[PDB]
Design a protein around this ligand. Structure first.
Ligand SMILES: [Ag+]
Ligand SMILES: [Ag+]
Length: 9
């Protein structure tokens, strides 16, 4: 999940 969101950066 963290990766799925942190793709923004
Ligand atoms: Ag994974
Ligand atoms: Ag990369």
């Amino acid at each position: 999940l963290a990766a799925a969101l942190m793709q923004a950066l």
